[PDB]
Ligand binder design. Structure first.
Ligand SMILES: O=S(=O)(O)O[C@H]1O[C@H](CO[C@H]2O[C@H](CO[C@H]3O[C@H](CO)[C@@H](OS(=O)(=O)O)[C@H](OS(=O)(=O)O)[C@H]3O)[C@@H](OS(=O)(=O)O)[C@@H](OS(=O)(=O)O)[C@@H]2O)[C@@H](OS(=O)(=O)O)[C@@H](OS(=O)(=O)O)[C@H]1OS(=O)(=O)O
Ligand SMILES: O=S(=O)(O)O[C@H]1O[C@H](CO[C@H]2O[C@H](CO[C@H]3O[C@H](CO)[C@@H](OS(=O)(=O)O)[C@H](OS(=O)(=O)O)[C@H]3O)[C@@H](OS(=O)(=O)O)[C@@H](OS(=O)(=O)O)[C@@H]2O)[C@@H](OS(=O)(=O)O)[C@@H](OS(=O)(=O)O)[C@H]1OS(=O)(=O)O
Lengths: 291, 290
């Protein structure tokens, strides 16, 4: 992701309320990281959000007027029709991918940052002056845990967050197996790390939990079937992960209110090179088991 | 469209060494006939050839044409595909070239290609060639017939065929119309099997065989490939799961004829459903132990 700017006093993007805006899809785990952290930090009235349609098209992510879907929205600001229109508005010569999330500056009309790992760090502190004391104190990447967080993020990112895509979009048996086996070795390892624990790092919520969560919450509903990540399921094969996952989802509204299983399943099962019939399976039931 | 039987004085006299089964291990319909062949001890009475599970543009190939571990060449006619057997029996045949085929080596014709009828043939037609214990086995006894028929009717419509209706449906509507009655019928079977080892009459019957070939393939293939995924057998249906495991692990007719590699190779090669042709490595294991 090639827009890697920050929101800093004296910088290109001064910290301000009502200036920065998030464009996301609910289906995207990467974009959902930023929705979760926006709710954790109480930024709803400080950073706006627009939900694009989960029905990825030949021109990328459409807005809700181009591709209607419950909860999908039109672009409020530029009559943008696809997320690529924002990128091209920011820079008509842009040649990257037109991905979500997009953290957008309404003032200069450009992309501040389109790397979810950096957007959620911006949110830890950039806006604290505008927050009540209890929200401003939250920091999901604190100094004392950074190195431990980075270490677990590195292999989670490689073998789990991206591992499910490597397996699901593999077009050869060999490439599928090379992705799916390390994926489940890493789940085995996460199962041990989370045994008897509520959080991955430091016995508190950190961005490591957010980054793992957005993949694990999509695992039984979409990755098992559609991406063939089916050696076992979270709910039946990984009790410590299952418990950690259900505590986050059911006990923290930041994780459930930003989790739209209908968007999730609609985006994945409309990937016609994997699932040409475009049928959306009705299971699993439920999307996530109760505590 | 071949619905003949094997009877004393009839067109197809009961004999040892004359009739031959052509089957694919992947096919639940053909596997019915493999299971009963073993239940009844017919292995040296009715021969068997295993076709390649790698279904082709020309239908089921033989093992020399499309090699796969355990797939065999046609021993009799150098047939390349199962359709070559049908066209030898009837050059004008216009049905589907399906397995199983119960074949007469003497007159070179298809006796019967309905798995539901082949397994009833195997109940009695060959008893004169069997030891007493195998000859006494009957999977469709008169006393249980009506109960077997009743459960077979909705198992056939909603479960045996239902997984296919769900998996090959090309619209959301048709997929939902199949998958919902499938799981309603699993719910119904779950109640039937709670505290029981067999569907009917507290003994093994063809009703068990006909259900087994679907359920044994459910977690390994139907859940994923055919989207039959409201819940799994092993985690969602304990009574079915127990019944299934007792058949598989305690009756070697059910395990010796169960080739999970053939099953998964055939289904996941179905390019109109799974264009990448990738075969998933899970679920692990194919069937959980007792
Ligand atoms: O954002 S883009 O820059 O990529 O816009 C382009 O759109 C197509 C290229 O992207 C891919 O589209 C298909 C589905 O999108 C998925 O993309 C990735 C999968 O790797 C998923 O998430 S993520 O990258 O990890 O963030 C994405 O998001 S999510 O998980 O749902 O949240 C998916 O939705 C995909 O194929 S498909 O099965 O859905 O049909 C990819 O095809 S492939 O199997 O890898 O080969 C495809 O790369 C391009 O359009 S397309 O018609 O080829 O599919 C492209 O258009 S093109 O260059 O003219 O060909 C981009 O649009 S454009 O440049 O503006 O015209
Ligand atoms: O036995 S046949 O007479 O049918 O030989 C023909 O082969 C093709 C037509 O059959 C089908 O092939 C594809 C897959 O086969 C599956 O068939 C059924 C699925 O409904 C499965 O089980 S069942 O016994 O009917 O209950 C079968 O068995 S099993 O579960 O593995 O045990 C499957 O393996 C199938 O699609 S797919 O595999 O590519 O995804 C069907 O296509 S469709 O999705 O329904 O639209 C197809 O009907 C024909 O060849 S083909 O190239 O179209 O695929 C056909 O050749 S043709 O006339 O030229 O078109 C038959 O071959 S031929 O007459 O000898 O030439």
């Amino acid at each position: 992701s090639t827009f890697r700017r920050f929101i800093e006093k004296g910088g290109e993007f001064e910290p301000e309320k009502g200036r920065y805006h998030l464009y996301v899809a609910y289906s995207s785990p990467w974009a959902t990281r930023t929705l979760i952290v926006r709710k954790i930090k109480g930024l709803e009235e400080i950073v706006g959000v627009t939900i694009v349609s989960p029905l990825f098209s030949a021109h990328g992510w459409p807005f809700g007027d181009v591709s209607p879907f419950p909860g999908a929205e039109a672009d409020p600001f530029y009559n943008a029709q696809y997320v690529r229109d924002l990128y091209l508005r920011a820079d008509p010569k842009y040649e990257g991918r037109f991905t979500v999330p997009v953290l957008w500056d309404k003032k200069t009309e450009t992309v501040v940052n389109n790397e979810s790992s950096e957007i959620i760090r911006i949110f830890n502190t950039a806006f604290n002056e505008f927050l009540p004391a209890d929200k401003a104190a939250i920091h999901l990447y604190p100094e004392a845990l950074k190195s431990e967080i980075d270490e677990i993020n590195e292999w989670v990112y490689d073998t789990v967050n991206n591992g499910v895509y490597k397996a699901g979009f593999a077009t050869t048996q060999q490439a599928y197996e090379a992705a799916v086996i390390p994926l489940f070795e890493s789940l085995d390892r996460l199962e041990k790390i989370l045994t008897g624990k509520d959080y991955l790092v430091g016995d508190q919520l950190t961005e490591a939990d957010v980054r793992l969560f957005v993949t694990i919450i999509r695992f039984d509903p979409a990755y098992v079937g559609h991406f063939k990540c089916n050696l076992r399921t979270i709910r039946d094969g990984y009790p410590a992960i299952h418990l950690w996952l259900r505590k986050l989802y059911w006990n923290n509204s930041a994780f459930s209110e930003t989790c739209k299983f209908d968007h999730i399943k609609a985006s994945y099962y409309a990937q016609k090179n994997v699932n040409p019939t475009l049928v959306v399976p009705l299971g699993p039931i439920p999307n996530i088991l109760p505590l």
